[PDB]
Paper text:
A key protein in T4 DNA processing is the gp32 single-stranded DNA-binding protein. gp32 has two key functions: it binds cooperatively to single-stranded DNA (ssDNA) to protect it from nucleases and remove regions of secondary structure, and it recruits proteins to initiate DNA processes including replication and repair. Like all SF1B helicases, Dda translocates along one DNA strand in a 5′ to 3′ direction while displacing the other strand. gp32 comprises three domains: the central core region (residues 21–254) interacts with ssDNA, the N-terminal region (B domain, residues 1–20) mediates its cooperative assembly on ssDNA, and the C-terminal region (A domain, residues 255–301) recruits other T4 proteins. gp32 that lacks the N- and C-terminal regions is known as gp32-core, and gp32 that lacks the N-terminal or C-terminal regions is referred to as gp32-B and gp32-A, respectively.
Crystals were obtained that diffracted to 3.53 Å and the initial refinement clearly showed the expected Dda/dT8 complex and additional electron density consistent with the bound peptide at the same location of Dda seen in the gp32–Dda–dT17 crystal structure. Residues 250–264 of the peptide are α-helical, and the termini have no secondary structure. Val258, Leu262 and Phe265 appear to be key in stabilizing the complex: Val258 interacts with Dda residues Ala214, Leu215, Tyr409, Pro411 and Val439; Leu262 interacts with Leu215, Lys247, Leu248, Ile251 and Tyr409; Phe265 interacts with Leu215, Arg216, Met219 and Ile251. In addition, Asp263 on the peptide forms a salt bridge with Lys247 and possibly Lys243, and alanines 251, 252, 255 and 259 on the peptide create the necessary space for Dda residues Trp195, Pro411 and His414. Comparison of these three molecules with the peptide-bound structure also shows variability, particularly in the ‘pin’ region (1B, residues 86–107) that has a quite different conformation. Note that the pin conformation in the peptide-bound structure partially occludes the ssDNA-binding groove, which explains why only three nucleotides are bound. As previously observed, the negative control fails to bind and the positive control binds robustly, which also confirms that the K38A Dda active site mutation has no effect on peptide binding.
Author numbering:
A (entry chain A): 4 to 439
B (entry chain G): 248 to 269
The structure:
Amino acid sequence: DDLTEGQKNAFNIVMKAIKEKKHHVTINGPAGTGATTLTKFIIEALISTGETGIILAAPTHAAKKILSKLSGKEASTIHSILKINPVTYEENVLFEQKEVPDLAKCRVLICDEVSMYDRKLFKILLSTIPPWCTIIGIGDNKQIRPVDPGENTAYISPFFTHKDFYQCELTEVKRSNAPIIDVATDVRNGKWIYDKVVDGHGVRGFTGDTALRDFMVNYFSIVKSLDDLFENRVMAFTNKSVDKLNSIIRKKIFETDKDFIVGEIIVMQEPLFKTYKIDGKPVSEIIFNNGQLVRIIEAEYTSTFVKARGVPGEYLIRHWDLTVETYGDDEYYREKIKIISSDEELYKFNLFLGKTAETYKNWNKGGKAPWSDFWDAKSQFSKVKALPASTFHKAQGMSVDRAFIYTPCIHYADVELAQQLLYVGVTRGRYDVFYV
Amino acid sequence: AATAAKKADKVADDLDAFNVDD
DNA sequence: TTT
């Protein structure tokens, strides 16, 4: 009940706004301010009092767990709740089946990790909420600005600037000496590096001749082929830098040169849709969401005939066929996916999708153009990535024990994404953080 | 020797062709 | 550079 002023202030302002009708609330407590702590009191107090319609949300699949495992009431993705909009946005289209209590009959709407919302998601949200579902968010205004490829405006999520969403800020850190907190507090002010060694479980980097050797021989010492690397994380900016890293990691952890090995755990990059045809109208059920961890069962490198109507000849696509089983806490499903592991041949599938456009960009050789086999073929494949090495953009919302960093690929990052990359770059490892 | 540009490239190339695996 |  007794916390710093911000936490003693934030809880009441939230309640005095949703007990009242019209105010909209967001809270911005950065690292150290105990935002994950402050969210709890908002929940355990409310479930004891007569305020119903309390529903919880998440922007991604990663952050869904660390809340529903933190609170005790079921959470969901912000998409799943609000008339799911898939990887490509839509409305009122249900894919999963969970009897999800997204009835839009709610006095309270909560969503954490508000540092990832583009405009496209907020406008749907406002057009969705009833006249009695007040929005109470909590996040970090200095984390990575939302990815919007369609706007040259380097803008942070609208959950801070919006009129109704008048936000309170937390300002005072409590843990009287944390080597990490003392780092990410200055990095949000634009200083971006230094070394601080306290108690042996802290932040330290590597330079000199054997910059990566000593840094890598520190990595492989922390994780000696453990195959338990969910808590030891390397994080990089580019996709070019990453696919080098997990390759090096694998050849030592999983001794082979194959891009994939049986019994290995991999992380997805797209929602695997299992699409059925009924009465001539398509439907869909999501099997594996974006961030959902899954395991491999059988590996084989094969080929496939690719074809589209109105297009001459046959094209040569070589890809993987891999059976996959569900890992962790989610429900157990088992189906198979197609993945191409060759930049040399990733181009060969784009040209099929490339030359096909011209045919459909004008297919006047009888009536209307058959756009089915364009998406019917593109929805065959998927994108994945290894678990030990994930990018900086996708490694958020989950705190790991020991963290690793790679700097040289961050020159191309501008001045404003940089500090939001290092803030999220340092804050992931709870205790130990190693960089280069 | 304030060459934060080159020192980031020295580390960039050593990742490009990392040492002969052990 | 970014999903």
